């Protein structure tokens, strides 16, 4: 298997709006997570259920990459069992979450009008997506203008959620060293 398509996911011209986040299936690859933790580009790299350090030793049966665009202020909501407009009405990470979250501040590039759900009748189920714009005829989706000139807690920020499972089925996405190194 050839190397894992991270640059094609990460350095794409556009990231989705967060209410319409997008999944990607990754398999048959040899993953190189080295790019992340650049400390001058990746401002947040935090794993749940495994050690970011232990990613280099592990093989995964299925890896999905959920992607979207929010503000710096709201990055902290992408965590198991957190509360917020994002976690309650946009993108929900399970309580039993296994995976990583990577986030970096693309403010000078991902500029424009992006959207987010502010209100919903019920909160969200884990990993559920709601692409509806109305409830009773009112727009249920409020707007972000991302600009270079807004303060940091308010700036554009791209997020990726690598969600994997270590159960049965052929082991398909293997770190550079799943041969006991």
Ligand X SMILES: *[C@@H]1O[C@H](CO)[C@@H](O)[C@H](O)[C@H]1NC(C)=O
User: Looking at beta carbons only, is 40 or 168 nearer to ligand X?
Assistant: 40
Contact call for residue 132 and ligand X (CB under 6 A): no
Contact call for residue 149 and ligand X (CB under 6 A): no
Assign 3-class secondary structure to the chain.
CCECCCHHHHCCCCCCECCCCECCEECCEEECCCCCCCCCCCCEEEEECCCHHHHHHCEECCEEEEEEEEEHHHHHHCCCCCCCHHHHHCCCCCCCCCEEEEEECCCCCCCEEEEEECCCCCCCCCCCCCCCCECCCCECEEEEEECCCCCHHHCEEEEEEEEECCCCCCCCEEECCCCCC
- Total site size for ligand X, rule CB under 6 A: 3
User: Looking at beta carbons only, is 41 or 111 nearer to ligand X?
Assistant: 41
- Residues 25-64, one symbol each (x = binds ligand X by CB under 6 A, - = not), give -------------x-xx-----------------------
Which residue is associated with the tokens 């933790």?
37
User: Which residue is nearest to ligand X, using beta carbons?
Assistant: 38
Minimum CB distance to ligand X, residue 27 (Å): 25
Minimum CB distance to ligand X, residue 164 (Å): 24
User: Looking at beta carbons only, is 87 or 160 nearer to ligand X?
Assistant: 160
Cα gap 55→39, rounded to integer Å: 18
Minimum CB distance to ligand X, residue 160 (Å): 16
Q: Which residues bind ligand X (CB under 6 A)?
A: 38, 40-41
């Amino acid at each position: 298997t050839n190397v894992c398509p991270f640059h094609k996911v990460f350095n794409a011209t556009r990231f989705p709006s967060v209410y319409a986040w997008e999944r990607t299936k990754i398999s048959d690859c040899i993953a190189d997570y080295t790019v992340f933790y650049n400390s001058t580009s990746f401002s947040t790299f935090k794993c749940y259920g495994v050690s970011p350090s232990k990613l280099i030793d592990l093989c995964f049966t299925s890896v999905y990459a959920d992607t979207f665009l929010i503000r710096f202020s709201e990055v902290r909501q992408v965590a198991p069992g957190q509360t917020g407009v994002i976690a309650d009405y946009n993108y929900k990470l399970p309580d039993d979450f296994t995976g990583c979250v990577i986030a970096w501040n693309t403010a000078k590039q991902d500029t424009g009008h992006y959207f987010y759900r502010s209100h919903r009748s019920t909160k969200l189920k884990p990993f559920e997506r709601d692409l509806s714009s109305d409830e009773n005829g009112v727009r249920t989706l409020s707007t972000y203008d991302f600009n270079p000139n807004v303060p940091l807690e308010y700036q554009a920020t791209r997020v990726v959620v690598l969600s994997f499972e270590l159960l049965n089925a052929p082991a398909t996405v293997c770190g550079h060293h799943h041969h006991h190194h």
